[PDB]
Structure formats: C-alpha cells, structure tokens
Amino acid sequence: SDRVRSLTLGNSTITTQESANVVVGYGRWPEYLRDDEATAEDQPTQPDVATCRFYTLESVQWEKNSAGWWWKFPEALKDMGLFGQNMLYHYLGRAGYTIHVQCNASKFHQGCLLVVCVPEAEMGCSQTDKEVAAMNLTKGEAAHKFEPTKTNGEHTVQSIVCNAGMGVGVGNLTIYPHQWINLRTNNCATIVMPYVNSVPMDNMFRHYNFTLMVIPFAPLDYAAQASEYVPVTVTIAPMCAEYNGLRLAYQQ
Amino acid sequence: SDRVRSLTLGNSTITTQESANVVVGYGRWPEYLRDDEATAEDQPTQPDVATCRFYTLESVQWEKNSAGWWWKFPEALKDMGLFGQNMLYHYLGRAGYTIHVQCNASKFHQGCLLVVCVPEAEMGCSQTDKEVAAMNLTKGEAAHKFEPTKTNGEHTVQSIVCNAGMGVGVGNLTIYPHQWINLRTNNCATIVMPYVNSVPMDNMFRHYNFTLMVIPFAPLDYAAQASEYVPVTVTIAPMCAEYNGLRLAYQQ
Amino acid sequence: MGAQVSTQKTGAHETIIHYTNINYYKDAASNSANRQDFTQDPGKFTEPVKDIMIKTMPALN
Amino acid sequence: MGAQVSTQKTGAHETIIHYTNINYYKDAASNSANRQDFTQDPGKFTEPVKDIMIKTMPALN
Amino acid sequence: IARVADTVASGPSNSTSIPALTAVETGHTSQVEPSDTMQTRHVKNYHSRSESTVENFLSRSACVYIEEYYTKDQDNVNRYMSWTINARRMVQLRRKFELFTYMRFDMEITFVITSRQLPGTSIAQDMPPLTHQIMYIPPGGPVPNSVTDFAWQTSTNPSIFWTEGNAPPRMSIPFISIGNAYSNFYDGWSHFSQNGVYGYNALNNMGKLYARHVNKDTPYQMSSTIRVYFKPKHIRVWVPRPPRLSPYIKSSNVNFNPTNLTDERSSITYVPDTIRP
Amino acid sequence: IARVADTVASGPSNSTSIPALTAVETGHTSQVEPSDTMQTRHVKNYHSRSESTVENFLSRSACVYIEEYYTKDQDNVNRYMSWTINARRMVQLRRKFELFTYMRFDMEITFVITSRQLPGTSIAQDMPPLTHQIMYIPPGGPVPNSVTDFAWQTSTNPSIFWTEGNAPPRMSIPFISIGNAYSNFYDGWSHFSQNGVYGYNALNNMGKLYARHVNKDTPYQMSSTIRVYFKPKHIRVWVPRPPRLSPYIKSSNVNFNPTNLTDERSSITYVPDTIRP
Amino acid sequence: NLQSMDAYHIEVNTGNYQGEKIFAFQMQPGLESVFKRTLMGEILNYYAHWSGSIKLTFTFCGSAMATGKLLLAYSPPGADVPATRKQAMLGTHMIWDIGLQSSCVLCIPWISQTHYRLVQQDEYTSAGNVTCWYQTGIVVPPGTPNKCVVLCFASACNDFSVRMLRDTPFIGQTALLQ
Ligand SMILES: CCCCCCCCCCCC(=O)O
Ligand SMILES: CCCCCCCCCCCC(=O)O
C-alpha cells in the first residue's frame, strides 16, 4: 500500500496512512553545494541533524469561509531551534526543505486544499500606489491569510484569493511544486523542495526564497453534529543546510 | 625559529613571535568519540568550524599586587557564538579546546605567570561550615580572582592563592597541563587540552570539566615611566565539538 | 589444571624462583592483585610538548 | 584430575583470565550454579504469532 | 557471549516503510529500535545481560523460615523445631519464585543457628558448646514428639549434627518433585469432587524438618533460633507471569486485598520542575 | 623488568651542547641526568620501581569506616549499623585515592567485627558465640528499620553471616561505577540549574551497608564494633594531582582552612651544623 | 483511578485543544509511578542499574471513523518540561497519524552521558520527559463518540539490560505468614 509512508529527518519522524505519493521539487532532490558551483571561499558549516529536522509551525483552523493562508521561508523558521540560530550568526545560507501539510477530517466531511510552493513569490500591495511592509509579507511562524474579497490596508498585501496576491490566476498555481488535500482521499501533502535560486547561496532574512500557500478550492463542509474544528498543521524540515560568513548574531 | 608560531581554527587565526612550544594535554590530541566508546545512540551533530574557533574572553589587568585569576569551562563560553547555542539546545557535549593566554610587556618589565588547566577543579568554600554557590565558582567570561589573603564570604570560594582554593600547594599545580609566561622570554602560552572526563560525554552547564588558572609566581614589576598597564587576555577554541540530545533551549 | 607458573620477586639470596597460580573463582574480580605490571611512560607529564625537545639543545631558538 | 578450565567474567582491568574447576562429589546436585548459560529466545513472548510480521511493514493489510 | 544488540547507523528516510506503525491487537510486541524512527550513529554495545540470567537471578541464598526452641523443659516452651517445608512464609523469595508458574532445579540449603541465654537475676553458668541436630523427614516418616524421641536415631532420614562456633551447616538436594517441575501455582483441587484443598498445598509436599539441642539440659533456660536458607541452582523456569501486586496475606493461598495499580500523582500531565536556577 | 636507568660513564666536555640550559616556560620537565653536568662512572643500576606501581601502592587494606551497635534494646542505643558507603571519612585512604582524579578497579572488602560486655556490678553471663550479619543494599533497595525487619531476609541483596572467633569475613566486588571510572573529584552539580549537591556526593552512590547481631537478645547489654576495610586491586588511575595540603574538614566536600605551604625555619640560608667535634 | 481501568485510559477529545498537553511524565522505568509497576519496571526493581532504549506503543481505541494526528515528543534532561508544542517539537518526537494501523511506536533512544543509569534515578542520572500534544485534532462524523481512549504500552528494546541485583521495594511483611 503506497497510502502509508514514513519520513525520518534528524530526531523527528512523521507518519501517514493516507498520503498521495510525494512531489519532489522540479524533479530534483536537495543536495549540498558542489565545488564547481561554490563562490564563498570559507569552509561552510553543516549542522546536519541539528538543523535538518521537522519543525512544526502554529496550526491553523479551516473554516467554511476560509480563503487561504501563506508562509514565507526560510524567514518563518527564524526562531526554530538551531536552524534559526545559524540564520542569525551567518551571512549566507542554503537549504532544501521537506514541506508536510497535515489535515484530517472524516468520510463525512468534504473539502480540497491546494498545497503549493511558489519560488520568489513577490507579492503586491493593497493600495497599488503604495508599497508593502515586511511585517505584512511574513510574520514568523504566524500565518498570513487570504481574503475572499479585496483588501484596503496601507502597506498590506492584496489578500484577495483569486489573484493569489501576485496578480495572476489561482488556477494556474499548479505550475509550481504542489499537491492537493482532497479529504475524501487525502490526509496530508508532502513536497520536497530543492534549493531554487539564481545564486549558489543567499541571506535568509533579507530574501524569502519561496512561499507556501494553502488555498482551498473546495469549501470545507459537513452536516450537524460533525466535528466543526478542522485544523491544518504545517511541518517543514531543512535539507542539506549549509552556512557561510560567520559573524555576530543579527539583532531582529 | 620555533619562537614564532601560527594557529588556525575556523575563521580565526592567532599569531605569535615569542612562544615556548605547545603543551598537548596529557600527550593526547582532541578527537571525536569513537563507536566503540559511544553511549548516546542518536547521531551527534558536529558544527565544526561553526563552534571550533577562537573565542576571546574579557581581558584582565595584571598589577603589582595581583594574586591570580581563574575561569571554568565550558561554562565560561555559554554566551560565545554558536558554541554556546549548542550548549543550550543539547543535553550532552564533548570538546577539546586550545587555550591561548596572551600577555606582552617589554625587556624592561618582569614577572612570571603560571597558565594551568585543572581537570575537575573542585573548589572549597570560604566558610568551611557552609557551601559554595555556582555564581561564585564561575560567572561567564568574567574571571574570578585569587586573593593574597584569606576570604570570608558566606558562599564564596577560598580565594587565598597559596592553596589555589583546593586545599593544596600552588607549587604542585605543575602536575597539570601547563606553561609559564616569563616576560623576559615569553609573550604567551598555549595548551591543547583533550576531552578529559570519566564519561564519553556530559552536560556542559551542570559540569565544569576543567578550570584555567593564571597564577603569578614572579610579581609584575618595572621602573618609572614604564607602561603600568599590562593586560592578560585569554583565548580558547573548542576542538572536535560533538553534541547529543537535541531539545528545547535551556533557560539560563 | 589451568595452572600458570610465573616468576617470583628476587630474594635475599640471589646473585626454583617461580610460583604457581590457579584461579578457582568464576569472576575475574576474585583474582589476586596484579603486583607485577611494570609499565611506564612519564612522557605524558614530563614532556607533553608538541615539538620534541632535544636535551643537548636550547629549549628556545 | 578431571579438571575443566573455563573463562572468567571480564575484570576491571581489561581492554590469564580463566579459572579451573573439578567436581569432588558424585551427585550433579552438588556442583556449583550454572552462572554462565547465556541462551535467549524472546520470540516465545514478544512474537508468538503464526504469521511472521516484518517490522518495516503494516501489521494488518 | 550474552552481549546486547548494537545500534546500526541510520540516516534520513522517506519511503513506504512503516516500522513505527503496527497493531498490538495481534498480540505481537513491536520489535522497533531507535535506528528505525530517527537518525542514529553506529555504537558497538558491549553491555551484557549476564546478570539477568534466571540462574544468576534465583541462585542466591534467601531466608525461607525461622523458629525458636529452648533447652530446658520449663513452662510450655517448645524444646524442638518442626516445619512443613515450603517457601511461602517469606514474601521476598516467594515473590521471585512466583514470577514463573513452573520451576525445576537442585538446591543448596544453609542453616544459620544462633543461641542465647534468657535474662535472669542469678544466671552464672559454664555450658560447653551447644550441638544441634537438624533432621529431614520426607512425607510418611515417623515424627518425633519429644527431644528424646526414637525418631532422632536418624536411621535412614538425612540429618545434620552441628556445633556452634563452626561455619553454618550446608548441604545440597536434587529435584525432589514427583512431577516434571515444581509448581508455584495450582488452579485445581486435591479431591476430584472439586473440594478440599485448593492451590499449592493441594499437591506440594516436601516433607518436614525438625531441629533440637543434642545436649541433655542447661542449668538455666536458653533458646536457639534456626534460620533456613534456600539457594536454587541448575535452574529452569517456565511460563512467566505478572509479579505480585497485593501484599501476601496467607501462606496457603493467594488471598489478597484490592490493591492500587500504582502510586498516585497530581495529574496525567504532572512532572516535577527540577530546574530552578 | 621495572629496572632503573643506569648511569653512562661521562668524561670532560667543551662544546655547544647545552643539556643544563633550558626553559620551563614550555611546560617541559628537564630530562637531564648526572652524566650530563659532570664526569660520571659507569654504574649498572639494578634498583627497581616495582613498589612504586599504582597497583602495589593502592592495593593494601585500609580502614574506611567504623560503627558500634548493641545487642539489648535498652535506652536509645542503635542495635544495628547503617552506612552510606564511601571512602571520605578516613583521611588516610582518602588522601591516597585523591592523588588521582579518576579510578577504576575491583576491590577486596574485609570486615573486622569485635564485641564486648558493657561494665556493670552484676553481669555474670554465659552467652553462646555471637553471629553477625552484614547486608549490602544497592541504591533503591528496601532499608531495614529494626533488627527484625523483613529486609534482613536477604532475598537478592548480597549478605554475609559470620560468627566470632573465625577469620574476619571477606569478599570481592567488581567495578560498580555506572561510569567508565570512579570519580574522586566532580567540579559540577547534581541539578542542571547549577545547584543542589556539589562535588563527589553529586554523582557517587555505592548504596548502603547494614549490620546486626542475628542473636535474639543478650542477658546484659553488649556492643560490637565493625570496621570496614577496602583493598583495591586490578587498579587503573588517571590524571594525577597535588596531594591534600589542608586537613580534611567535611566528608562531603573539599572545604579547608588556609594552611601553610610547609614548615618554617630561621632563614633561606639556614642549615643546622651537625658537625661539632 | 488507582483501582480502576481508568488508570490506563488516556482520553482524547474532538474540538480545538491546541496548546493543551494531553499527558506527560518522567523517564524513570523503575522509579516513575507510571512505569514503576509495568512488567518492565517491575523487573528493573530487582536491579539497581539499567541501560537501553524503551518502546512506548500507543493504540487508538476510538471508532473506525475517528481520525487525528498526535505529536509524541521526548525531551532529554537539561531544560524545563515543554510548556508548548513548539518546545516539545524541538526534541525527539513522533507524529502519529491514526488510521488502519491502530498502534504507533515512540522509541525513546538511550541518550545518556553514562553507560548505565540507576533504577532509583536521581537528578544526576535524569532521563528526561515525554509529552504528548495534538498535531492537528480529532475530527469525527455525526453520531460518533467525541471522547476516545488511547492505551499506552511500554517495553525494553534489544539494546536494554539491567545490572545490579537488589531486592524489590514492593513487597514486605511484619511477621511469618500462616
Ligand atoms: C533435606 C531438606 C529437604 C528440603 C526440601 C525443600 C524443597 C523445596 C521445594 C520448593 C518448591 C517450590 O518452591 O515450589
Ligand atoms: C558489597 C559491598 C559493596 C561496597 C561498594 C564499595 C564501592 C567503593 C567505591 C569507591 C569510590 C571512590 O573511592 O571514588
């Protein structure tokens, strides 16, 4: 049975009895930087099991009127164990990441989520005449959510779902590494993202390599007396984490 | 010329033009824990260059009436870059350390220090009827100093030099890995300490593996108009740092 | 038996000086002390230097 | 005699460790305990199943 | 030889292998190890289960009985000892034996006999060393009714004569049981009509053991206390079982009082804070 | 085998060889010998350092404890002994062990038990030989609260039964430490918050040892004194250190009073004139 | 519950319970009241030293329609007990997904400084703690219980071993039985 699967990274292990295979980035699997592609001359540090493990973020509640959510990495993991510590003390970073979104219900509930990883998910502002604030793009492990209607915020992100806050069609986000969580068949979604960037390495605070978006295309629904609380938890584990440029920790 | 020497660990490098060879612990050189001597089953983390580098502690001033100083490791390095971060997040630790005490003067100054590394330097209390407080044993990179006379503190350490705060003779401390800093010939002292303990690994906050003591046997002296400020700086770099038992950081 | 003959320590009539031994107990902790292990290596404490120092030469140069 | 040399249990000075034994009595009940019989087979209690179960596989399918 | 399993070095994982998932309903105990649910390093484990052996576990002299008998014939004091051999009157050893349903082994029996002189105003004596006699009487043999009974002739019954001061008397015995193994538990009766005796006493019968002073008489009253010790060797055990939870009440049956499964605590989430800088 | 170095015959000298000159700053102990700083004759030295061996040095029975326990239950006198095993209450042996930081070895334990009869006006007795019982209780085992506690059943705890007059009881024990070596010094705490117990007592825990008279009671009060002796064998020692200078104050820590480095004298040039014809 | 089957019951409910700790306890196979009496711990009490890993098997006894994900974490000695799921998640954890496979094993690796530990564990030979949280939650269909029982099983691994023979402190008497 390919339904059941097990994931093991570091001192963490995830279990599943209702998965749907595993999407591996753009056909590639996380790998350390090679010598014929490196730029930083200093010998990198590789904490390995210390940083490459499963980090669970704050759960989110899926409601009949939920429009979606989104996280930005590696920023969202700035306060996660040693992975966040290396981000502070190092100028350059490089990691893989294994996204694992969980969400279970019952054979009597219905709904369908879209777990996607969007590289360089540059987003727009609510007020097209102004700019956006980092605080409105990503706020730690705290998820930002999409709205079923237009936003008005000064420096807020245009959370209107239909445009995914990028000025595009949500139905075309399938062009990015993704999976769906169709409650009647699924229970979770896993995506192994390889380091994608136009540079061997990059800062992890200044640059948001990719954005994880969970947009429901099939509204959550159910009958009376059926558990109304359906949470959606996101777990991610860095892979082949390398760091360069060691210096005094950065004051957030 | 064996006078000049260079040390390179991580992104740090020390230079010397007036050293006196290098003492290597008890004939042994730092090495990672072997499989036939390990106990912790989990795969350890080895930050390498991230934690194994030269960490300089607060300098100290050598005065004509100075009685001595002492530091306790790895405790003293609890707030040093990533080496301190791994101490917080891990239950077990293991490291080598390369002690390098600097202290220069001139051909017109005189004095002689005793740089020693005392394993399990269990110390006594000022008031033999009471106990000592961790706060009085080691206080971060801040050095505790020996006194030329008896102490009286409630839970203070018997800082009287002649007994080195251990109830022994200071003249016999030469039985521990050491070197002297005879200003007329020296300029610094280096000691490579191998992991010494009755256990493969151990906690780094609860246990003070060894104590570094700098006791002057030849009082600092000089003539008029001769620089009166003679500082003594201590630099130490972990070696073969291994960590086990990853968990939530420990609140100091 | 599993007898093991060893050499005795010099007597006051030197310059058949051997004894026999057999362990009767199953635990090695029951055996007698090892008063005849003469190993040495002062180097650890007397010469723990990284660079070999030749006696007939200057310590520093 | 009918001496029988066996191996002693590791001592606190490891990494002549053998003892000799001879039975003097005619009844086997007189002999010393068998403190060196190290047999094991937890299967009886931990895996008393009729169908072998492979760890890396589902218990039921 | 009796070494423990080593831990294979394990790395990352991502497959359909589910060693962590199982089903206890099968009555099968999971055979998982750390390397199956995380990244582990190679470790040459030299530990040994040599002291966990049923032999090393049960082969240790443990007291099983104790009685006192006097020298002079004053009042209604027993001048000799009588005992229906069994190991159900000493909770310690009894609890170990009861970890298994059936047992088979030879046994080393040691006796610790000590004497004393009862208090008094004028008790100046000079009694020679006291010699004792321990006689085993297998089921059916004639039992002595006095410290001068003909039964003490020990014509064929095994007996020991020991004088104080010397090392405590000892002697080994084979596997007496008429069955293929000693039975610690017998969920049955002695009579076919399902009545009479129930349990251990229904079938076990190792006979009796008597003791006395071979000395004729003492000027002033004195007493001795004999302690019997059992040390099974060449052991064999079958069918392990839940250790005794409720305190032992009777030495003839398994009666007990409803005992707690274990000690209590604040709540299921209670864990004492031992870190307080 | 453990022979000492011989002295090579040396003659005049006049070169750039400087064996006498060095620099202690390196932390290197001069390896010079008489033949390097003078003219010496050849000498076949047969001396041996056979008695300087750590084995021959520490392998000698040394008293580590001593307590007294009475027979009769009069007043508030302890009728049994209790002791939290350790060798920090006897300065002699404690000072030797503390010459090294870590130790590993098996050990031979001997007990010297002696009794007596307390003074009195009318104490005419005739007590038989006194039998004693020494029981070792590893950390966690049940502790007896009386000379008749069930704990003395010695079901699995090692115990010795000895009667006065015979040779002092003895028995060997392996390397108990849960660590790879016994620790004489522990510059750390018992709690992670850097508090609680500090030093030896923070980690060492060899359990307890109890003793008592197996004799029921004595007409008149009597007492016994047990002396425990330790004799390490199959020794291994690491990290040597400065011998104890200040007298021992507590047996739980290294507290001390500022002690003199050594005895005094008239002046640095003082040397007693022992030649006075 | 010291004398009822509820002592073994580990309830789990439907609805929001984020941030709530389902249960927790220390890792003292022979001293902890939770393990003290299990077959495993019951044996350790005849010894003073122990070493090896432990297998904590959890079985969901709810209905076949109930679903959910629990986070079984284990934190080695050194820091305070995880007060939040994030803190617990930083340690050795196992995310159990309830499904056809009823049971799930949380193997507690032997991560000690010394080779052995005392059954009569003190702070020095501390083993750590085990806390359980809600990874997601327990969703259930209409007409189905909202509270479910989760049984816990404990046993030693192939790397476990005892060492110091001693008497168990769970049995005694005041006089010869009759
Ligand atoms: C010569 C003395 C004979 C004593 C016989 C003792 C037999 C002990 C049998 C114990 C049976 C059991 O424990 O189930
Ligand atoms: C059966 C008696 C057991 C006694 C155990 C004694 C162990 C002594 C250990 C001494 C430790 C030390 O000196 O650092």
XYZ file of C-alpha atoms and ligand atoms in Angstrom, chain F residues 85 87 97 103 105 107 109 136 158 171 173 176 182-184 200 204 206 209 230, ligand 2:
34
model
C 29.322 3.545 51.532
C 35.864 6.363 51.440
C 42.716 7.968 46.311
C 39.992 5.440 39.281
C 39.422 -1.256 39.872
C 38.005 -4.403 45.357
C 36.437 -5.893 51.302
C 24.710 -4.674 51.251
C 24.405 -9.826 48.969
C 34.606 -10.887 49.680
C 33.402 -6.850 44.281
C 30.393 -0.946 40.207
C 35.201 6.120 39.648
C 35.423 9.877 40.137
C 37.265 11.293 43.155
C 31.506 13.820 45.000
C 28.717 8.781 43.575
C 27.541 2.935 46.001
C 25.662 -1.333 54.178
C 38.979 -1.563 51.387
C 29.199 -5.355 48.828
C 29.793 -4.037 49.320
C 29.807 -3.025 48.174
C 30.666 -1.826 48.571
C 30.886 -0.922 47.359
C 32.124 -0.060 47.606
C 32.449 0.754 46.359
C 33.628 1.681 46.654
C 33.733 2.724 45.545
C 34.735 3.808 45.942
C 34.542 5.019 45.017
C 35.664 6.032 45.171
O 36.518 5.899 46.029
O 35.697 7.107 44.360
